[PDB]
């Protein structure tokens, strides 16, 4: 699935009062049991990067965000190989789990999908 | 809706054609001649270009210096160019300096000295021109392209001619050339901008009335070329940019497929990495090339002559290890003109061309060039309404039929210049002119 | 060009009889106003990038369906954005300009990937001509800042997204925008601009940081790609006589395979060199330049001496014939400038944005031999001569040698 | 140093009590004599390449067995080739110099693969310091040719094998060669040089093409690698008082973590900038320079104003204390210059080749406050000031501002 | 064998009057029957080039010599694949068969062999 799809569907849910009342608590629990925060990751660190679109989005990250992401990946890799969890300041707090990459990939995808549409335009 | 092109004739058979524009203050008047290098044989090849030099070297009345002064005093400029099938001599001036400019043009064309001293002087100037075109890579590529495509035929000859001829051109053969070719029935006096047609016709009666008529007056733009699939490789590892042209035999001015070929050309289109908009063009080849950095530029062309043409593409690239990809993807986009194109690409290209054919004519010189070209190739100026109708008549299925007989599995003429080690041999290039999947 | 006003924006249009319209937005945002070096060039290259209503990609695909073309350039005085299209497609192009001025996104990735690389290729292409470089270097010496700022973005001074965003906040404002329509019905344009540009900020007039100051000197740009030399004379009081003088001194041939009868043209005999006199009026100061290019530094040096001699000789005495020749060449130059769409737009742009009435080509003044010789005399006796050498600079002349 | 003559070659040697000798060949072949830009740098880099009796490789392997070292450099006046070795190894080093002067092969491959790349790295290392660049640019403006020629080979002006071979034919000749031996027994050196350099051509004295001419002006070198500014004043009549003035004005601190009590040092207070006054005597002309480097163009500008003021203030008055401090700092500078083997060689080299008798540090003249103030007054009121700006040149001062 | 050895041995033979009297005529016949001149080659064009030493020598050729060598190789390759011989001006005449490469390879090898010797020096 494209990030675009995921973001659009999520926004439909967040609009509907009933839907949000059910989904938002479930999603928060899911994220807690997922346990990626216990390795010091942010959610966006987990997104598959081996695609032209994602490689382009990563190149557009501000250098600072890019350097910090590298450190989080290396740190998580070190926790993984040691079979340890993050402690203290290494644990990602909910307020630190920011969607730093989502705006970049949404722009990359917006252009790519517009290109696909316009490649199929028919003069009327 | 542009003002109507007025056309009159003289008794000798000189055509006068004019398009007035009361919004401008300048006027381009000139003489378009249905004659060029193609009219030479092998012995006097280079004569037409030689004459162009001597036309500005002085006449029976005005010396070279007086000529210079007369034009300086007029305020505008004179210009000339000789091609394979067409010679042009024009004058851009102020509105009220038009009678002076017509008089000067009539003088240099009819009453040029061609003095042995001036022939001898230019013979060195022209010799130096042989070793300086070498820098104009596009021109080098296209001159070799004609030489190979029309191997040993008049269209295959260069305009400058061989070194040997330059040393042996006499005033006799110069005079003979311009007497045989520069006849009234082959000439068009053109005015664009701030010109009155009736005034221009009077000036023609005053200055161009004693022009010879040819013995057998054929219509304007009257011509057998036998295309040779072939290649010229001018490898130069010291150049950073490779220049490659690939062409097939194209269409003449009066072909029934003239507009079909223009639409096909617009489907591939042009590309230039230095232009900001080029990365967003609709053309499939443009997308492939820009995304993969395969080229600095490409330019599709459809060049027409009286009885043949060349249709193809000119590529420039610094990507010396992916020349193979560039050529591969180019020829696969040509394949799709035969196999895949539908109303989607065709209607898009027609939209783009309906405007493009009108946009091109944006100054008095461009308008004069358009009137002069059309009168000397078709015998008439084609109105925008007629052009709009001919474009509208092109269907996807005309394009497919045209590409299937003109491009698909056909011989190409190929010229490569520069670091072209990565350009494969003739067979592998020509094998991309078809698709085994189709 | 009937000058009018539509919702605070100055609109000049001239109807014609052609299927082709040119619509130009002229912005008071040229390099003399550049906050940061090269920012005017970058802003020019940022036109028709992503806007909020329409992406760069969508714009280009739709432009191709109209068969329209886009032309942009930067001067010392203006940014000019010109579209060329079929007459009937006018509303689309007005709306596209409105989107650019009101709603350009200005994204960091556009600057890094699209705008800055195109700006860099633009400059490298221009610099391939050493005469361009020489004349640019001469403005830099003569004015230092303002008119002396580089027109083009260079690598040594990087323009940031914040620089361009700030400059655009000033420039893209009712006070700095003029709309020029060639072959556009004037009443129709006013109606469209009045609806499309209504919500554009009013802003304030952009100004040159500091007064124009004149300086003499030398620039020695060492290149390996050709040789040129400019001899410039800064003018404190720009006068129209310098146009006549530029065309008189001349330099290019009016005829194929010739030298020309102009004094500067006759200075190049026996050499493969070319020469061009130009005069640049900038309202509050001017520049009279003579640029010489060639492959031989020795020949350039030879022509340079004859060129300054020619100017001195003109200061002595002009003939009536020569004065008439200057009037004719100057009237012609004025006419063709008003015809060429790029220059046309900026001429009327100046009239609208500043208040300098255009001199119609048919109203170009005839200067007597007295007035021309007096003009050349002032220049030969200038206290602040500028010389910019490009190429093998060790072999090109110096100011004190000339 | 006992000056003598051995087979037409001037030999100066001073015996000492140390195990280490320094033998230097000083050649009248510095860049003021260069025939082509950069040849004297290339010739310097061609020393100890392949000779007919001994390859470059063999020389280096044998030098290592003696534990000797090789030092070469180029100035505006000389090429200096210096070897440092154990005293007893003298005959080997004399013979090695003889091989270089008489039988250097000068092969195209050495130029392409060995000499030119080393010359290029040498220059790039020097230019890492913007102050080097500024002072080089200042000489170029001030003298144009001769002393104004670049010392170092640059990419824009390629030196060919024929250029270097021709220059070497002139330079490597008894008339242009001086031998200087530090801690070498003078009688032993004369005997060895007399046998080894006997078959060297006599040749003729190399001369500067053209007389030294002085010019004022500006150079503006755009680098992205730091900022510097030189304020130079050409001197038509070189006088020893300018050494005293250079030391007085000073600029570097004479103690760690401090600013210094010199007028130019006190001009840097509140800034991370450094400053250095220098005087260059070239016999027939001189250059007095003040170079300022720093990371801030604004701070450099600030110091540059204070620096010019300091010079003017000096032209007004110097106290007796200040004149004595100048004598002390100047005597010291002289002493350490005569000690450093690198500068020592060129000092005696100038006495041997030209004839300018050296001034012993103990004989350095004491200048009264009157003589110092007069020297500074003559500089503040010079008609030909040179200013070379390096770095963000748009933000550095101009000559007319100073 | 190194070019050095070949050149040295040849020089020993050329020195000896008796030896040269026998060898020079044989060598000239050998070269005639070899027939490399009939493909427009010079003798030095045939020397094995795929060694560090020879690659260095080829890089040191003057550009003109280098360009001409390339043409001779391409021309000979074309004769080879066509099973044709050179005719007319394409045939290498004895006076054109110059040792253009020998000086370069002799210098390369001189240094290489000196390096080998000096790598084995013993301080006495």
Tab-separated table of C-alpha atoms in Angstrom, chain C:
chain	number	residue	atom	x	y	z
C	1	UNK	CA	-0.172	49.863	-25.733
C	2	UNK	CA	-3.153	51.344	-23.921
C	3	UNK	CA	-1.924	51.748	-20.326
C	4	UNK	CA	-4.686	51.168	-17.705
C	5	UNK	CA	-5.228	49.864	-14.160
C	6	UNK	CA	-7.042	46.764	-12.982
C	7	UNK	CA	-7.469	46.171	-9.232
C	8	UNK	CA	-4.302	48.090	-8.389
C	9	UNK	CA	-2.236	46.381	-11.092
C	10	UNK	CA	-0.963	48.333	-14.115
C	11	UNK	CA	-2.021	46.630	-17.361
C	12	UNK	CA	-0.815	47.581	-20.867
C	13	UNK	CA	-2.269	45.871	-23.926
C	14	UNK	CA	-2.210	46.367	-27.687
C	15	UNK	CA	-4.706	44.509	-29.854
C	16	UNK	CA	-3.485	43.109	-33.172
C	17	UNK	CA	-4.430	40.897	-36.108
C	18	UNK	CA	-2.644	37.640	-35.348
C	19	UNK	CA	-3.664	34.247	-33.856
C	20	UNK	CA	-0.795	34.562	-31.334
C	21	UNK	CA	-0.848	36.484	-28.047
C	22	UNK	CA	2.097	37.227	-25.757
C	23	UNK	CA	1.296	37.899	-22.100
C	24	UNK	CA	4.153	39.121	-19.905
C	25	UNK	CA	4.319	39.840	-16.206
C	26	UNK	CA	7.063	42.357	-15.572
C	27	UNK	CA	8.271	42.425	-11.973
C	28	UNK	CA	10.286	45.147	-10.272
C	29	UNK	CA	12.614	42.488	-8.990
C	30	UNK	CA	15.706	42.594	-11.139
C	31	UNK	CA	19.180	42.216	-9.687
C	32	UNK	CA	19.613	45.879	-8.684
C	33	UNK	CA	16.993	45.115	-6.022
C	34	UNK	CA	18.430	41.720	-5.046
C	35	UNK	CA	18.561	41.423	-1.265
C	36	UNK	CA	21.084	38.576	-1.597
C	37	UNK	CA	23.398	37.977	-4.636
C	38	UNK	CA	21.648	35.899	-7.293
C	39	UNK	CA	18.234	35.923	-5.649
C	40	UNK	CA	16.539	37.576	-8.643
C	41	UNK	CA	17.810	34.836	-10.943
C	42	UNK	CA	16.591	32.157	-8.504
C	43	UNK	CA	13.181	33.812	-8.181
C	44	UNK	CA	12.917	33.897	-11.987
C	45	UNK	CA	13.728	30.156	-12.130
C	46	UNK	CA	11.142	29.545	-9.382
C	47	UNK	CA	8.322	30.828	-11.584
C	48	UNK	CA	5.863	28.087	-12.603
C	49	UNK	CA	7.120	25.665	-9.946
C	50	UNK	CA	4.513	24.054	-7.688
C	51	UNK	CA	1.714	26.365	-6.666
C	52	UNK	CA	-1.062	25.421	-4.244
C	53	UNK	CA	-3.771	25.153	-6.980
C	54	UNK	CA	-1.563	23.609	-9.682
C	55	UNK	CA	1.674	21.596	-9.656
C	56	UNK	CA	4.585	22.410	-11.975
C	57	UNK	CA	3.916	19.051	-13.649
C	58	UNK	CA	0.248	19.777	-14.220
C	59	UNK	CA	1.059	23.234	-15.596
C	60	UNK	CA	3.533	21.865	-18.136
C	61	UNK	CA	1.146	19.111	-19.283
C	62	UNK	CA	-1.653	21.620	-19.792
C	63	UNK	CA	0.624	24.171	-21.478
C	64	UNK	CA	1.421	21.430	-24.050
C	65	UNK	CA	-2.322	20.947	-24.713
C	66	UNK	CA	-2.651	24.654	-25.573
C	67	UNK	CA	0.664	24.470	-27.435
C	68	UNK	CA	1.782	27.483	-25.363
C	69	UNK	CA	5.389	28.424	-24.600
C	70	UNK	CA	7.036	29.870	-21.499
C	71	UNK	CA	9.932	32.342	-21.516
C	72	UNK	CA	11.533	33.869	-18.454
C	73	UNK	CA	14.537	36.116	-17.955
C	74	UNK	CA	16.167	38.388	-15.364
C	75	UNK	CA	17.672	41.817	-16.026
C	76	UNK	CA	19.257	44.368	-13.698
C	77	UNK	CA	15.872	46.029	-13.523
C	78	UNK	CA	13.205	43.363	-14.037
C	79	UNK	CA	12.164	39.768	-13.904
C	80	UNK	CA	10.127	39.047	-17.021
C	81	UNK	CA	7.824	36.047	-17.287
C	82	UNK	CA	6.307	35.689	-20.753
C	83	UNK	CA	3.795	33.216	-22.159
C	84	UNK	CA	2.992	32.794	-25.836
C	85	UNK	CA	-0.325	31.160	-26.765
C	86	UNK	CA	-3.342	31.265	-29.100
C	87	UNK	CA	-5.471	34.396	-28.574
C	88	UNK	CA	-8.539	32.555	-27.234
C	89	UNK	CA	-6.576	30.866	-24.413
C	90	UNK	CA	-6.041	34.215	-22.602
C	91	UNK	CA	-8.058	33.417	-19.373
C	92	UNK	CA	-5.975	30.308	-18.638
C	93	UNK	CA	-2.702	32.263	-18.838
C	94	UNK	CA	-3.969	35.121	-16.679
C	95	UNK	CA	-5.015	32.603	-14.022
C	96	UNK	CA	-1.642	30.819	-14.234
C	97	UNK	CA	0.220	34.071	-13.559
C	98	UNK	CA	-2.126	34.752	-10.634
C	99	UNK	CA	-1.306	31.309	-9.169
C	100	UNK	CA	2.423	31.988	-9.452
C	101	UNK	CA	2.276	35.391	-7.732
C	102	UNK	CA	-0.194	34.447	-4.982
C	103	UNK	CA	0.408	30.775	-4.241
C	104	UNK	CA	3.931	29.531	-5.129
C	105	UNK	CA	4.839	26.787	-2.602
C	106	UNK	CA	8.640	27.438	-2.600
C	107	UNK	CA	9.756	23.969	-1.447
C	108	UNK	CA	13.335	23.148	-0.415
C	109	UNK	CA	13.451	20.167	-2.773
C	110	UNK	CA	12.435	22.379	-5.733
C	111	UNK	CA	15.325	24.699	-4.936
C	112	UNK	CA	17.874	21.868	-4.580
C	113	UNK	CA	16.761	19.605	-7.406
C	114	UNK	CA	15.020	21.804	-9.953
C	115	UNK	CA	15.634	25.524	-9.596
C	116	UNK	CA	19.300	25.837	-8.569
C	117	UNK	CA	20.606	23.275	-11.175
C	118	UNK	CA	18.712	25.027	-13.984
C	119	UNK	CA	20.049	28.412	-12.800
C	120	UNK	CA	23.560	26.947	-12.874
C	121	UNK	CA	23.216	25.605	-16.439
C	122	UNK	CA	21.760	28.987	-17.509
C	123	UNK	CA	24.854	30.813	-16.270
C	124	UNK	CA	27.361	28.306	-17.688
C	125	UNK	CA	25.731	28.611	-21.113
C	126	UNK	CA	25.990	32.412	-21.017
C	127	UNK	CA	29.605	32.347	-19.839
C	128	UNK	CA	30.608	30.202	-22.815
C	129	UNK	CA	30.725	33.617	-24.517
C	130	UNK	CA	33.697	35.574	-23.018
C	131	UNK	CA	32.062	38.845	-24.128
C	132	UNK	CA	29.135	38.202	-21.772
C	133	UNK	CA	31.585	37.692	-18.900
C	134	UNK	CA	33.520	40.865	-19.805
C	135	UNK	CA	30.429	43.038	-19.871
C	136	UNK	CA	29.159	41.557	-16.581
C	137	UNK	CA	32.551	42.125	-14.939
C	138	UNK	CA	32.492	45.728	-16.193
C	139	UNK	CA	29.171	46.464	-14.499
C	140	UNK	CA	30.560	44.997	-11.288
C	141	UNK	CA	33.591	47.317	-11.274
C	142	UNK	CA	31.583	50.344	-12.349
C	143	UNK	CA	28.752	50.184	-9.828
C	144	UNK	CA	29.922	47.725	-7.109
C	145	UNK	CA	26.426	47.202	-5.664
C	146	UNK	CA	22.906	47.725	-7.040
C	147	UNK	CA	23.605	47.790	-10.782
C	148	UNK	CA	26.902	46.187	-9.849
C	149	UNK	CA	25.261	43.087	-8.332
C	150	UNK	CA	25.590	39.973	-10.473
C	151	UNK	CA	22.457	39.243	-12.500
C	152	UNK	CA	22.938	35.495	-12.177
C	153	UNK	CA	23.260	33.133	-9.229
C	154	UNK	CA	26.815	31.841	-8.749
C	155	UNK	CA	28.151	28.868	-6.764
C	156	UNK	CA	30.404	30.881	-4.475
C	157	UNK	CA	27.398	32.684	-2.997
C	158	UNK	CA	24.533	30.204	-2.310
C	159	UNK	CA	20.935	31.410	-2.240
C	160	UNK	CA	18.807	29.828	0.478
C	161	UNK	CA	15.119	29.034	0.466
C	162	UNK	CA	14.630	31.740	3.082
C	163	UNK	CA	16.371	34.339	0.889
C	164	UNK	CA	14.136	33.516	-2.068
C	165	UNK	CA	10.960	33.389	0.061
C	166	UNK	CA	11.694	36.816	1.564
C	167	UNK	CA	12.499	38.408	-1.791
C	168	UNK	CA	9.324	36.933	-3.287
C	169	UNK	CA	7.303	38.397	-0.385
C	170	UNK	CA	8.490	41.862	-1.430
C	171	UNK	CA	8.413	41.373	-5.204
C	172	UNK	CA	5.185	39.455	-5.668
C	173	UNK	CA	2.973	42.433	-4.711
C	174	UNK	CA	0.590	44.786	-6.607
C	175	UNK	CA	3.175	47.583	-6.330
C	176	UNK	CA	5.877	45.673	-8.183
C	177	UNK	CA	3.843	43.977	-10.907
C	178	UNK	CA	3.015	45.129	-14.455
C	179	UNK	CA	1.050	43.086	-16.985
C	180	UNK	CA	1.874	43.548	-20.702
C	181	UNK	CA	-0.334	41.957	-23.385
C	182	UNK	CA	0.839	41.872	-27.014
C	183	UNK	CA	-2.053	41.053	-29.422
C	184	UNK	CA	-4.463	40.974	-26.490
C	185	UNK	CA	-7.774	42.865	-26.509
C	186	UNK	CA	-7.158	45.594	-23.849
C	187	UNK	CA	-10.667	45.578	-22.370
C	188	UNK	CA	-10.665	41.786	-21.976
C	189	UNK	CA	-7.298	41.728	-20.226
C	190	UNK	CA	-8.349	44.414	-17.720
C	191	UNK	CA	-11.459	42.388	-16.826
C	192	UNK	CA	-9.440	39.203	-16.293
C	193	UNK	CA	-6.527	40.733	-14.387
C	194	UNK	CA	-9.095	42.560	-12.260
C	195	UNK	CA	-10.632	39.305	-11.078
C	196	UNK	CA	-7.477	37.187	-10.887
C	197	UNK	CA	-5.051	39.613	-9.216
C	198	UNK	CA	-7.545	41.139	-6.756
C	199	UNK	CA	-6.307	39.229	-3.680
C	200	UNK	CA	-2.602	39.775	-4.392
C	201	UNK	CA	-0.952	41.736	-1.571
C	202	UNK	CA	-0.529	45.440	-2.145
C	203	UNK	CA	2.986	45.376	-0.619
C	204	UNK	CA	5.393	48.284	-1.103
C	205	UNK	CA	7.737	49.435	-3.883
C	206	UNK	CA	10.991	47.512	-3.847
C	207	UNK	CA	13.997	49.841	-3.692
C	208	UNK	CA	17.733	49.655	-4.327
C	209	UNK	CA	19.639	49.371	-1.055
C	210	UNK	CA	21.831	52.477	-1.353
C	211	UNK	CA	22.316	55.161	-4.003
C	212	UNK	CA	24.045	54.386	-7.294
C	213	UNK	CA	27.747	55.246	-7.014
C	214	UNK	CA	30.191	55.241	-9.947
C	215	UNK	CA	33.730	53.826	-9.761
C	216	UNK	CA	36.582	53.240	-12.209
C	217	UNK	CA	38.926	50.260	-12.202
C	218	UNK	CA	39.879	46.914	-13.734
C	219	UNK	CA	38.657	43.330	-13.612
C	220	UNK	CA	40.865	40.449	-14.741
C	221	UNK	CA	38.762	37.306	-15.062
C	222	UNK	CA	41.189	34.491	-15.928
C	223	UNK	CA	39.388	31.901	-18.107
C	224	UNK	CA	40.705	29.273	-20.557
C	225	UNK	CA	37.655	29.503	-22.831
C	226	UNK	CA	38.209	32.517	-25.107
C	227	UNK	CA	39.305	36.138	-24.795
C	228	UNK	CA	37.355	39.365	-24.488
C	229	UNK	CA	37.825	42.922	-23.318
C	230	UNK	CA	35.281	45.534	-22.307
C	231	UNK	CA	36.107	49.227	-22.124
C	232	UNK	CA	33.291	50.798	-20.194
C	233	UNK	CA	32.637	54.406	-19.219
C	234	UNK	CA	30.151	54.938	-16.338
C	235	UNK	CA	27.705	57.782	-17.067
C	236	UNK	CA	26.347	59.870	-14.192
C	237	UNK	CA	23.777	61.681	-16.356
C	238	UNK	CA	22.170	59.208	-18.832
C	239	UNK	CA	21.238	61.049	-22.047
C	240	UNK	CA	19.622	59.672	-25.290
C	241	UNK	CA	22.582	60.873	-27.382
C	242	UNK	CA	24.566	57.841	-26.171
C	243	UNK	CA	22.251	55.539	-28.177
C	244	UNK	CA	23.117	57.474	-31.333
C	245	UNK	CA	26.798	57.341	-30.385
C	246	UNK	CA	26.664	53.573	-29.735
C	247	UNK	CA	25.072	52.941	-33.139
C	248	UNK	CA	27.457	55.362	-34.880
C	249	UNK	CA	30.598	53.716	-33.451
C	250	UNK	CA	28.804	50.470	-34.270
C	251	UNK	CA	31.018	47.405	-34.624
C	252	UNK	CA	28.913	44.549	-36.193
C	253	UNK	CA	28.554	44.325	-39.996
C	254	UNK	CA	25.226	45.128	-41.678
C	255	UNK	CA	26.077	42.723	-44.481
C	256	UNK	CA	27.313	39.081	-44.759
C	257	UNK	CA	31.044	38.381	-45.254
C	258	UNK	CA	31.901	42.032	-44.538
C	259	UNK	CA	33.571	44.172	-41.902
C	260	UNK	CA	31.272	47.208	-41.954
C	261	UNK	CA	31.745	50.945	-42.476
C	262	UNK	CA	31.419	51.846	-38.784
C	263	UNK	CA	34.602	53.192	-37.052
C	264	UNK	CA	34.776	50.242	-34.626
C	265	UNK	CA	34.167	47.772	-37.469
C	266	UNK	CA	37.089	49.325	-39.377
C	267	UNK	CA	39.284	48.878	-36.269
C	268	UNK	CA	39.083	45.094	-36.729
C	269	UNK	CA	40.521	44.960	-40.270
C	270	UNK	CA	43.245	42.318	-40.547
C	271	UNK	CA	42.009	40.545	-37.405
C	272	UNK	CA	39.554	37.772	-36.570
C	273	UNK	CA	37.993	39.922	-33.844
C	274	UNK	CA	34.533	41.376	-33.372
C	275	UNK	CA	33.513	44.541	-31.548
C	276	UNK	CA	30.237	46.020	-30.326
C	277	UNK	CA	29.461	49.393	-28.764
C	278	UNK	CA	26.522	49.399	-26.387
C	279	UNK	CA	24.828	51.910	-24.183
C	280	UNK	CA	22.879	50.851	-21.088
C	281	UNK	CA	20.469	53.347	-19.593
C	282	UNK	CA	19.424	52.477	-16.018
C	283	UNK	CA	17.575	55.714	-15.275
C	284	UNK	CA	19.890	57.157	-12.636
C	285	UNK	CA	23.161	56.036	-14.219
C	286	UNK	CA	24.340	54.580	-17.501
C	287	UNK	CA	27.123	52.552	-18.984
C	288	UNK	CA	28.785	53.019	-22.317
C	289	UNK	CA	30.687	49.901	-23.258
C	290	UNK	CA	32.850	48.666	-26.123
C	291	UNK	CA	33.395	44.916	-26.045
C	292	UNK	CA	35.974	43.119	-28.173
C	293	UNK	CA	36.224	39.359	-28.473
C	294	UNK	CA	38.652	37.225	-30.450
C	295	UNK	CA	40.941	34.208	-30.214
C	296	UNK	CA	44.162	36.231	-30.209
C	297	UNK	CA	44.985	38.384	-27.131
C	298	UNK	CA	47.478	40.265	-29.334
C	299	UNK	CA	44.754	41.144	-31.852
C	300	UNK	CA	42.322	42.163	-29.103
C	301	UNK	CA	45.015	44.493	-27.705
C	302	UNK	CA	45.537	45.946	-31.194
C	303	UNK	CA	41.798	46.579	-31.669
C	304	UNK	CA	41.436	48.025	-28.151
C	305	UNK	CA	43.923	50.793	-28.948
C	306	UNK	CA	42.152	51.604	-32.231
C	307	UNK	CA	38.800	51.538	-30.394
C	308	UNK	CA	39.780	54.223	-27.892
C	309	UNK	CA	41.326	56.200	-30.752
C	310	UNK	CA	38.012	55.952	-32.678
C	311	UNK	CA	36.191	57.406	-29.665
C	312	UNK	CA	38.718	60.290	-29.439
C	313	UNK	CA	38.461	60.898	-33.210
C	314	UNK	CA	34.676	61.068	-32.830
C	315	UNK	CA	35.100	63.660	-30.071
C	316	UNK	CA	37.046	65.751	-32.599
C	317	UNK	CA	34.693	65.796	-35.582
C	318	UNK	CA	31.684	63.984	-37.005
C	319	UNK	CA	30.456	64.601	-40.553
C	320	UNK	CA	26.812	65.336	-41.418
C	321	UNK	CA	26.673	62.045	-43.364
C	322	UNK	CA	27.911	60.181	-40.281
C	323	UNK	CA	25.403	61.954	-38.052
C	324	UNK	CA	22.585	60.917	-40.401
C	325	UNK	CA	23.898	57.341	-40.507
C	326	UNK	CA	23.736	57.407	-36.699
C	327	UNK	CA	20.136	58.573	-36.677
C	328	UNK	CA	19.147	55.852	-39.154
C	329	UNK	CA	20.940	53.040	-37.308
C	330	UNK	CA	19.530	54.253	-34.000
C	331	UNK	CA	15.920	54.589	-35.196
C	332	UNK	CA	16.181	51.050	-36.587
C	333	UNK	CA	17.629	49.701	-33.328
C	334	UNK	CA	14.769	51.314	-31.399
C	335	UNK	CA	12.170	49.821	-33.758
C	336	UNK	CA	13.432	46.227	-33.634
C	337	UNK	CA	13.692	46.442	-29.820
C	338	UNK	CA	10.026	47.451	-29.570
C	339	UNK	CA	9.157	44.502	-31.848
C	340	UNK	CA	11.102	41.735	-30.064
C	341	UNK	CA	8.710	40.407	-27.330
C	342	UNK	CA	11.371	40.115	-24.607
C	343	UNK	CA	12.619	43.689	-24.935
C	344	UNK	CA	9.164	45.072	-25.734
C	345	UNK	CA	7.751	43.807	-22.413
C	346	UNK	CA	10.549	45.447	-20.411
C	347	UNK	CA	10.244	48.769	-22.278
C	348	UNK	CA	6.559	49.153	-21.415
C	349	UNK	CA	7.296	47.518	-18.053
C	350	UNK	CA	9.653	50.408	-17.319
C	351	UNK	CA	6.970	52.919	-18.376
C	352	UNK	CA	4.367	51.269	-16.135
C	353	UNK	CA	6.540	50.469	-13.135
C	354	UNK	CA	8.698	53.555	-13.066
C	355	UNK	CA	7.247	56.399	-15.074
C	356	UNK	CA	9.757	56.734	-17.898
C	357	UNK	CA	7.575	57.287	-21.004
C	358	UNK	CA	8.662	55.061	-23.887
C	359	UNK	CA	10.333	56.853	-26.758
C	360	UNK	CA	8.530	55.614	-29.871
C	361	UNK	CA	11.025	54.705	-32.697
C	362	UNK	CA	9.413	57.402	-34.878
C	363	UNK	CA	10.206	60.017	-32.201
C	364	UNK	CA	13.886	59.118	-31.786
C	365	UNK	CA	15.768	62.426	-31.786
C	366	UNK	CA	18.171	63.355	-34.583
C	367	UNK	CA	21.494	64.477	-33.087
C	368	UNK	CA	23.598	67.051	-34.963
C	369	UNK	CA	27.366	66.368	-35.489
C	370	UNK	CA	27.971	68.914	-32.701
C	371	UNK	CA	25.903	66.958	-30.144
C	372	UNK	CA	27.517	63.635	-31.094
C	373	UNK	CA	31.096	64.910	-30.948
C	374	UNK	CA	30.363	66.532	-27.577
C	375	UNK	CA	29.050	63.189	-26.267
C	376	UNK	CA	32.152	61.330	-27.447
C	377	UNK	CA	34.367	64.036	-25.942
C	378	UNK	CA	32.866	63.574	-22.457
C	379	UNK	CA	33.547	59.835	-22.732
C	380	UNK	CA	37.141	60.151	-23.920
C	381	UNK	CA	37.712	62.520	-20.981
C	382	UNK	CA	36.167	60.319	-18.288
C	383	UNK	CA	37.715	60.251	-14.808
C	384	UNK	CA	36.469	56.735	-14.056
C	385	UNK	CA	37.273	54.335	-16.969
C	386	UNK	CA	36.516	50.661	-16.446
C	387	UNK	CA	38.364	47.833	-18.218
C	388	UNK	CA	37.385	44.178	-17.847
C	389	UNK	CA	39.720	41.602	-19.384
C	390	UNK	CA	38.630	37.956	-19.786
C	391	UNK	CA	40.840	35.019	-20.840
C	392	UNK	CA	44.618	35.252	-21.099
C	393	UNK	CA	44.573	38.289	-18.849
C	394	UNK	CA	48.369	38.655	-18.747
C	395	UNK	CA	48.265	39.449	-22.485
C	396	UNK	CA	45.286	41.777	-22.526
C	397	UNK	CA	45.536	45.613	-22.104
C	398	UNK	CA	45.258	47.554	-18.849
C	399	UNK	CA	43.276	50.752	-18.188
C	400	UNK	CA	46.437	52.878	-17.869
C	401	UNK	CA	47.677	51.575	-21.232
C	402	UNK	CA	44.457	52.794	-22.930
